[PDB]
Known about the structure:
The structure is cut from a larger assembly and holds 3 copies of chain A, 1 copy of chain C, 1 copy of chain D and 1 copy of chain F.
Chain A: E1 9-12, E2 21-24, E3 30-33, E4 37-40, H1 45-50, H2 64-70, H3 73-89, H4 97-107, H5 118-123, H6 128-134, H7 137-143
Antiparallel strand pairs in A: 1-4, 2-3
Helix pairs in contact in A: 2-3, 3-4, 6-7
Chain C: H1 2-22, H2 29-32, H3 36-42, E1 57-60, E2 68-72, E3 78-79, H4 81-94, E4 98-103, E5 106-107, H5 109-117, E6 124-128, E7 144-147, H6 150-160, E8 169-170, H7 175-180, E9 187-194, E10 198-206
Parallel strand pairs in C: 2-4, 3-5, 4-6, 8-10
Antiparallel strand pairs in C: 1-2, 7-9, 9-10
Chain D: H1 10-25, H2 40-50, E1 56-60, E2 66-70
Antiparallel strand pairs in D: 1-2
Amino acid sequence: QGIEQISKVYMHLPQTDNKKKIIITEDGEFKALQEWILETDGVSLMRVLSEKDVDPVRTTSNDIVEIFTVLGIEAVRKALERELYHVISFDGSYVNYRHLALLCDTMTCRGHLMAITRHGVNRQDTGPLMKCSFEETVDVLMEA
Amino acid sequence: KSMESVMVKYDATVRNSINQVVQLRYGEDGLAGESVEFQNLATLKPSN
Amino acid sequence: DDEEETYRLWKIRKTIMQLCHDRGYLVTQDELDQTLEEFKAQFKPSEGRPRRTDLTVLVAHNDDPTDQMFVFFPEEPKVGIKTIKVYCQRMQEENITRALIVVQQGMTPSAKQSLVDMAPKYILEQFLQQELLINITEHELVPEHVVMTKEEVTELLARYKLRENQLPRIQAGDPVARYFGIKRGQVVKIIRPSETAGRYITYRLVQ
Amino acid sequence: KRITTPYMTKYERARVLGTRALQIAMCAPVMVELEGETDPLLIAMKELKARKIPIIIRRYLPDGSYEDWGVDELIIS
Amino acid sequence: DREVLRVIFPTGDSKVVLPCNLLRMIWNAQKIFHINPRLPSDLHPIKVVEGVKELSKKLVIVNGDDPLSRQAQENATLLFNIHLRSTLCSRRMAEEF
Amino acid sequence: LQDLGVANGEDLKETLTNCTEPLKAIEQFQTENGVLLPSLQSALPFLDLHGTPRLEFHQSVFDELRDKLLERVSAIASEGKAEERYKKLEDLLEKSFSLVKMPSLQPVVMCVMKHLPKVPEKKLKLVMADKELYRACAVEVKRQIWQDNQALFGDEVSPLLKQYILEKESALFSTELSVLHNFFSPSPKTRRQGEVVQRLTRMVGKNVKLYDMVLQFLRTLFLRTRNVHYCTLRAELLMSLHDLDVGEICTVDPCHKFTWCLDACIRERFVDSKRARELQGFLDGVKKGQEQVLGDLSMILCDPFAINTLALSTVRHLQELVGQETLPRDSPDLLLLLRLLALGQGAWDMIDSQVFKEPKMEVELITRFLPMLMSFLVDDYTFNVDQKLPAEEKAPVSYPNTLPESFTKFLQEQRMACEVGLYYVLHITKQRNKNALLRLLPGLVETFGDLAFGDIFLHLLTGNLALLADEFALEDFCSSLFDGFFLTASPRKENVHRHALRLLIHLHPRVAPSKLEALQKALEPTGQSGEAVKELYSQLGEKLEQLDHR
């Protein structure tokens, strides 16, 4: 039984409000509910989302290319923003959101995951001299 | 080097060297990061 | 398993009704709200009512009553060219250009090539059975997507003095792009909440 | 039929002051009455407050067009 | 506006980042003009409503009059306009400030 | 009041006057004319002890319990049996019809009537005869009256139709010259949000009889006034009804499925082959003994935007067929377009006398006129390819600007050839080729039914002249437009004079003042024309004044 690639599932209740289930009561008040959430060690998101009695709204992943192949480029933009915010604000350090938004928009501007590494950025269309100044000067120059 | 040339153009849009729109307004609001500051929305939390 | 197969097919049909409604096609309200018990009552879940031929639906567009679409569920695990031509003869009989084919697990590479071949005269889209078990647009990460009309795109480019090359892009094989059936040259208006402006409306050109 | 902001940007202020200070340093005629002023930059800032600098800023929009703004027309922020 | 904020902030976090610190400016106004909060005030509520409307017009991120640019303008300053109307509502002006 | 034996001010008068005893009389009145309940009979002296008038109490409880009247009739609207509903509504109706004369109790009667689909005839009559009642009554009573009273339904449609024709005249003659905006710019939905069609749909509700009365009104209006606009309104009303999902009218009108294309076909302003096949099937479905709908269909096809759709589809068909080496005869789609256009153009002939036979086409249209259009176009593209090919020596030959006159004969003897040639002229103006333009500009002067001089082509030509805004720099071109073509029908037709005058309004800065004054003097109103041309002349004089200062 089970779904392949998922070798360990930990079950726990959240102690942070961001993971708690915030609902709006009948009086318009925010109530945070303790709900069981399962954190895995593998990734197969389409199968888990299809699975019975799994909330296919808030169920997410920390793997970006899974979100891309499963959900789409805009879901990738949001999830990437959320992961960058998480890793930055883990140590209580605040960065203005517009910088994160600009980075995630730049990466996802071309409708596909454009990695900051030389492959993604030099793959993307820029001037020859700019790609030269990046890295990989000679081969860029030879192709140009 | 990924975000070298991304600039706020004179039509208030954020574009790269290729003149491709990255954001229609900077930070989705067009506001610089210095003058903004933390505040509270008074009507969010209170009951009906 | 005979037990869960009607549940699976019911959720697939629910996703397809939600899709066709989002594509503008006329879907009756109860079809979008059909329960599993209602689904079973509508027709044994296997060998008495699995019939992937019978589940095939025909829907009509609300902007044109003759613009119609077929959803076809083939009964084989891998669909071959002869099934593609069977559905082509079906379309020619009803004169419906656009069609949708579900796929149980996989599709023959030759059948991909035939799908690419008959694209201009007949727009048929394939979809894995696994993908349709959830409507991805309900996911919190997926923002609101709208397909713009041509006059809207021209007004947009005229307002911002833009060329379509300068817009952000979206691949035509994107799950949301496939969900809406958009093709290259279409423009998608994406509406999403923003923590600094409230709402943000961006645009993406299909590629 | 102008769409750019009516406010002089920080970079516009910087370049205008530098250019006008260079002009004043090159014995250009001064467009404001000055008293005990020798540094070109102070005279340029006095002209800027006076809105008497004789410069037009050409702002290029990202479509190959432009708008020409007299410096007196812009709001000195 | 409250319902809109409930949509935008489902977590119920009131902490937000905005250009103009409205409470501090109100306090600055109170101290500049020596506003005694123990006495009735001479500010008409309808003046508050009309003034906040004209101010909302005066704050422009996207300039234009076609539906596209107007919608973009209303979306760009949606959150700040919600905060402005909530903060400078006539009730709080007549009671708190 | 006295209908139900209730004492009124007349009773108070006869009990007050000729009475040496006012005091016991008013006392017994105020006691026996109070509120019927024992708690109040204890509380009324106490209530009144504070100087509190009984007025405030009476008014407040009257308003509250009258709101309860409105709420309870709204609730019983769809509660339980219809028999119980309509029985209680009829009872309260007869009770408060005594009090319908009053200003405070008439809304009770009207709310009851609003919840009644059909009503006793005497109440309907008294609602009609008393103008205060009818002006105070909602349309629920009025639909029922109109179902047996065609006169007032005509009276109500008449001002709406009058303002519709006034707005149509203003839009067809609105002074602004632009390829972008014109009379044919707005979408079908934008033209269907007009108050007239929405009010008429409300006034018809879901009754076929009122629809048939609207139909006969539209027939009379389009025929006796010879104005196609009513036809468009008919189609709008029908498509508006389809938006309301009134199956009582969608499933009875056979031209409703025709309106499926015609709306989808006007919003594109082009008939694709699929919707062409749809229209073919609809025409083939017309059986014998029900061919009157063909007249309706011709009326439905007499819409100006439908004419624009069909003409542009034919013009673009012939434009694209040249690359395929296909003649107009070699295009069954184009034959179907010509069939439908012929059936549409004779629509007023089908209303004037009930003609349910198809009008016939011209052979020389297929073999001479349209092949002459295609003659001019393929020579056009030939000299274009030659210009794009190098090595042209000194003194190159111009494009042949001679005109075959059988072409112009078909323009001036065949309304279909006339209008398709007009839309061809507009299309090449959008292409703005001066050579072919001045080649065919002669012969357009004499054309069939003054269609070259009608509102449609003149408005569209003036809209397309924005693309030719700078082309007025040549006095020869300006004379070709003005002295050649426009001014022939200016002094004899009002619309032509107005269209030339508004052309001068827009193009005054892009011509030398000598020619501007020449065209101004040539466009003097004839001494009997409408206010439009003289107002445009005053604007011309003002503009000529303003040009000398720039």
